[PDB]
Write a protein that binds this DNA or RNA. Sequence first.
RNA 1: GCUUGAGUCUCGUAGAGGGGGGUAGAAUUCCAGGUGUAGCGGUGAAAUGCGUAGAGAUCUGGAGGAAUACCGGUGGCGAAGGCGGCCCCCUGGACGAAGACUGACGCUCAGGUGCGAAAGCGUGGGGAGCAAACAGGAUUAGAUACCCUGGUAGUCCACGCCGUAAACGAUGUCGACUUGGAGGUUGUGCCCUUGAGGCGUGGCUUCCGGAGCUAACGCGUUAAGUCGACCGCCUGGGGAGUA
Lengths: 51, 100, 129, 88, 55, 218
Amino acid sequence: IKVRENEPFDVALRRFKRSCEKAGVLAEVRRREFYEKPTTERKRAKASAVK
Amino acid sequence: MRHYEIVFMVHPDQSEQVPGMIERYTAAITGAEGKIHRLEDWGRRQLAYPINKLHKAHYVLMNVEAPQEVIDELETTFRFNDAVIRSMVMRTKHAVTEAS
Amino acid sequence: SMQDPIADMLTRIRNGQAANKAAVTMPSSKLKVAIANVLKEEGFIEDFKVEGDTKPELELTLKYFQGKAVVESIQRVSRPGLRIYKRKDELPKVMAGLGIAVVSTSKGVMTDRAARQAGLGGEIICYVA
Amino acid sequence: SLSTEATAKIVSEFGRDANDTGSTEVQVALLTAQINHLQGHFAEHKKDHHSRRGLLRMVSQRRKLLDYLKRKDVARYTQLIERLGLRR
Amino acid sequence: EIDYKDIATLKNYITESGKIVPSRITGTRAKYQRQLARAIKRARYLSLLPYTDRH
Amino acid sequence: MLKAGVHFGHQTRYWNPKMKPFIFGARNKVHIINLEKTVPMFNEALAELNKIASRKGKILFVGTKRAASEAVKDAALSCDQFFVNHRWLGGMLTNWKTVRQSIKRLKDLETQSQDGTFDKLTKKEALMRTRELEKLENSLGGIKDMGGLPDALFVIDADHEHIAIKEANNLGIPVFAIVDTNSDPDGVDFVIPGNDDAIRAVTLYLGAVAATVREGRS
RNA sequence: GCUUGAGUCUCGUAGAGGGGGGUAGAAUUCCAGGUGUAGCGGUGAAAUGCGUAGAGAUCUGGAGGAAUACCGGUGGCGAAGGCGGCCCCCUGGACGAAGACUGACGCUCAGGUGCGAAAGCGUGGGGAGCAAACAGGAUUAGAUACCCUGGUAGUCCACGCCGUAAACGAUGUCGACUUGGAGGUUGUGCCCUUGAGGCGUGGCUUCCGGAGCUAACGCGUUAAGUCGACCGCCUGGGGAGUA
Ligand SMILES: [Mg+2]
Ligand SMILES: [Mg+2]
Ligand SMILES: [Mg+2]
Ligand SMILES: [Mg+2]
Ligand SMILES: [Mg+2]
Ligand SMILES: [Mg+2]
Ligand SMILES: [Mg+2]
Ligand SMILES: [Mg+2]
Ligand SMILES: [Mg+2]
Ligand SMILES: [Mg+2]
Ligand SMILES: [Mg+2]
Ligand SMILES: [Mg+2]
Ligand SMILES: [Mg+2]
Ligand SMILES: [Mg+2]
Ligand SMILES: [Mg+2]
């Protein structure tokens, strides 16, 4: 989120934003509501993460 | 008789009311033959976020054993009294001491 | 439920047998025993035992002959839903003659062979072979 | 869900001694006791359907028990319904 | 954990932003992850902890 | 009574339930077999083994795993017995009459390695036909001469020999096998409990079989 | 009569179980203001729309409704429907450790009664966002659509209706019996607690797999296996869940 970076450099270094928000809870909340269908999405998202 | 934490937090400006407030609540609860097992006047603490405008506000902890009734007529007074910017009364599960 | 306990016995055999299980036990009853008796006397079970007193404990030793079990099939016939009562001329003979039919009579739990000789009939508890 | 104090009370008011907890009457009695208490819970609220299910449960139980008693000791039955104050 | 007042222990179960950290990271037990969050929630309300890093 | 210096038992979870009656294990999350039950099974193992070996022993020491294979190309191999120490070409018992010609090729080749045609053709064809030989060589050694039908079969690890046992089971070939805790028995007429893949339990019972077929009727 | 089935009693545990009252921060929309100035918005591309009565952007204060990020998980509760911020109040169920009391008091249940998503209906209320209808802009041969700009009912609360969903595990309930393996969750007994544990012992659950069962797929101790008690239901497709 915040980086108050300091002395001798110019590079972005903001690899933090791909550690929480951005397209995390953002591509998410963007569009179709969902409702009971996430349940189905996150149910297939465990059947996968078994092996 | 049940237990509660309770931890109302008062407004800076009305700081020197905090002693009278505590005197008062203790009186009320003791009068119902309910005891009082901890008390901690944490004073002016700094706020995480700035609740209600104004950062930093005066905290007070309690820990009481009193009949679901006087604990009832507490949040009311806690509402009425716009000097108390938040309150909270909690679980129970037997008394407590020190921590914090 | 526990409502028919004899079918429960019949099945504890049937099952354990197909599980190649040496023994098998169950709450006892007067009735239960008199049957195991017949099972033994006709050589289907190895030997029974009632190790109890207040909470009786009928216990049976299953036999296995070749590789098989000795009980190729054990079905209930009568049952609390529908009770079967054959006269005597009507007594059913299992596997032609081989295997038996456990029948209760005005004189005790016998086999169809026995009951036929006795000259009587009654409730035909179950079939065994 | 009824006070250990109060539940005990009734055990000592309908059984041989306290400990005679399972005595018919005693069940029928501390059910009654709750059933009645509860009638005020559901006086407010009323939309507390779920809890209501336990209450119905309570009734149908005590009913079965009451029935069984009458079947056994018809005396202890009448005495009980009079003294518990029901069956009209 | 065993309590919210312990903001001490707590501050190491929340990201910079203040978001409650998944149990697959804390490596914490179940029952406790709940006691944890519950106490964190509890601590945000009494302004002993931020909801957001925006303050 | 024991002899097995160290084959005790072997194999941990993967136990096959049916291998209960030959297990008393529990050490450190792996079961030790019934040390004293493996034994009365050498009674019957080597007994009906030697029993058919006098009446004339034609065995087939079937065993594989690049870490135990060659240790079957020995008195197992040498004496009154034949062996397979590589990938068991499925249907080699069951298609013996197809594979029979896979023999004619082997011979008609080595019988012409240092014999017949050889140093002629190309200096290509050479080890560019002993790539043929070295191949058919392993997997199809113990076949070579068969002479007297496969008659019992000694097999190393019952389930790892899925096929060959099954084949036999089909053909009436009594299958003597040692079956770990994990392996499925009953495919085995003469079942030999205990470890199956430690360099010992092999050579031990393995060499000890050679040492009873090898001699039975002088 | 009996104590094992079934209840009752004692202490405790976990829980988005139900009902009621408070309350919190993040956001959106709106109102006011500061600064700032020519665009913003939107699509596949556009246009309708919005902005010099100063929009968007940015900061500040305020009002309002609705839902509760992270925790969060083949995680948890409930009879099904279904139930996720925090707190108090009322309350249902489940499970476990002991022992004590009742003494077959039980299982199932046509008729009956209760509950029962979302939509929809009745009266008042409430209304930020979403959005049937409807308007406008597009696309298109056509476009009563999919896309865009708007937007009414409704979605929110109270009281009362309606009683249906692929209301699904498309698997009625209860009880007994029958090889295994790896988890998750939740009690509890024992061990130098001396390891963050170690060995057991219940409840609940996920994946996998044996016999067996099956048309096959697959099910598989949470059976679709082996049995019993009771109940609902099927008898070619269409016609019709219609008259
Ligand atoms: Mg009887
Ligand atoms: Mg706001
Ligand atoms: Mg603002
Ligand atoms: Mg409760
Ligand atoms: Mg209704
Ligand atoms: Mg509705
Ligand atoms: Mg309405
Ligand atoms: Mg639209
Ligand atoms: Mg229907
Ligand atoms: Mg389903
Ligand atoms: Mg159903
Ligand atoms: Mg299992
Ligand atoms: Mg499976
Ligand atoms: Mg079944
Ligand atoms: Mg109709």
